[model samples]
Target: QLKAVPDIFDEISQRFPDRVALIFDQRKITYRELAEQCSALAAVLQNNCLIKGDIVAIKIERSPELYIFMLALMKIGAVMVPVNSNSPERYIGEVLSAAGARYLISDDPGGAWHVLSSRTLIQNCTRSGNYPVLSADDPALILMTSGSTGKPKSVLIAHRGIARLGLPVPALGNSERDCYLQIADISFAASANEIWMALLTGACLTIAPPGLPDLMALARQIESDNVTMLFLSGGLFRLFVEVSVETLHIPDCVVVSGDFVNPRLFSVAVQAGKAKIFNGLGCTENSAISSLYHIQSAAALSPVPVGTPLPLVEMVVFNERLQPGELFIAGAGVALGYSDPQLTAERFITIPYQGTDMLFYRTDDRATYDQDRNIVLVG
Candidate 1:
């Protein structure tokens, strides 16, 4: 039994469709227009027989279209496999084959099509269409990245699960809602913070330049654009806060989620009042964010240990012994396993959380129960 697919944008679009939804460089589009575009793409995907359970691979270069594809696939209930366009052909083929994806959605040709064998070309097209809405439990996307295997692995995610990232439902309580700056590629789940979070909420999102961006240029853009929210990789955050402690300004919310947060980095950002620096942890398998650590107030100078879990996402931790522990997560938010049953079974386990049997995602990171009784990943 799944609850209604919670779309935070639903109400906002209904009330204020003409409001600015996203602003990338000079391109500005309204919320109502974005929804219509998503619906249009959703229709195309549905008509092409890309139904629920089918994996649709997107290999587009960084653009507004890529963001649209992610949301459009979610709207239609099809699983999305977002891969870096520059990813090696061999690795890309392995991921596509492993996911058993049914369709390949790309806006550019280049060498993407040539990577796959002739027999695996199920749906060969470089365009997108409208798809149908999904339920909470419906599979949403697949984020493939380098893991402990030193090989690419897929992180399975669901629609309702990803929806947990936004505030209001559980009320994440971010400060001074402002324009969001998305600085990640589709291959990284952090990018969803800009594409999905900004779209869902009534915030403006500005897409970063493609390829490796110049650091000085990016900083200038952040200040000039009145960007209030900025998302960065853990290492990047450390570098930014260290080099520009005195000059750092422009954002009210600075989030770092790809890796562990450094203490020095946290202190500089906090002292400069650049923004409320947050440490987030999640994998592609969980759609986007499962836990968040918002560091505010003088007491949170060194970064808090306990990060709050999103609604319906239960975090429990198991020690090295694999015994019942405190931070392992289990809920409807869990992925629908992987395309390969054996691989899925190996990575995903059924564990009882609260009372019901929920699929638990064993993260590579470890955590302990802090004073707040919330789970905090060990630094």
Candidate 2:
């Protein structure tokens, strides 16, 4: 019944404490260690006056402690901004100001501005203290993306958005037996799904090495990590296709949130690894995935049909046999909306549906339902 991301993770940790929770930098930690470490940091953060609704920025690299801070901050009901440490000071300042974040958790150093060193806090422990009661609609994470203007666009993702309303991950078949590779950068929205989905599902989250790996290097890392589940962007998949499927491993499942999946590429990839192709259509505004289309074979046509909305996701397409229009997404995975009030008002709308008020996010992309009612995206 827990809709909050941290709550769901805590439940899983307690249920299977000995399970491998995360693998990073050549070390792996069990659910017990992950839970205890996160709580250890959570206690110190709470004692340091961090509380619910406070925005905190984590400027850590791809380490296990980074994940610890993520869970710790969210467990306190504090909205976190997982910052890219490589960004210059100007970019970092803008993100901090945009989020109104006063507290920063970093490994490097601390200053008068309440920047606390994560190193000191790691030695902290827990008292089984009470955490804040959270609503499913409460803001849990804020992500920064490029904006048209100088200011960064901040997307507010809800607790349910991250937890996906406590439902089992659909299509991708994530389970305790799976090992998911963490390839996406922390700044991007895709990484959020990679991190939370694997941990919440009792799967082992293996963090890839720092920096973008070339296609060959990436495939090598994927092979070495013993990764059974992979989620790569469409662009990366195109590169993999360029090198031929000989470079890829047979991960149990493969999902790409792509602009357009080359039909030939799909065929070769399926033949190579026998991996399930789940081409999802989603935006940062939609939290993670919104719809899923299972490519049954290599014969997928252009603009391959993106099957339908996942559980709790509503795609506002007409019941007509064929039509194209702007797509509006509403449901559990829909973002809480943008951080800027004006932008939020412009993009997200609420309409009465089934006798209840439902929030919907407006999307610029246009698509139409095919004869089978599957969405086919077109510019």
Q: Model 1: runs farther than 4 Å from truth?
A: 1-11, 45-53, 109-133, 166-177, 246-248, 297-306, 319-326
The TM-scores, one per candidate, come to 0.82, 0.90
> On residues 159-269, what C-alpha lDDT tens digit does candidate 2 reach at each position?
888787236566765667778888787777788667877888787888876666556666776777777878888878877867756545557777778467776777777
lDDT of 1 by residue, 288-346 (tens): 66677767764455344547776677778877665654356776467766555777787
Q: Which residue pairs clash in candidate 2?
A: none
Rate residue 242 of model 2 by lDDT: 74
Best by lDDT: 2
Compared to the true structure, candidate 1 yields what TM-score? 0.82
In model 2, what lDDT does residue 284 have?
78
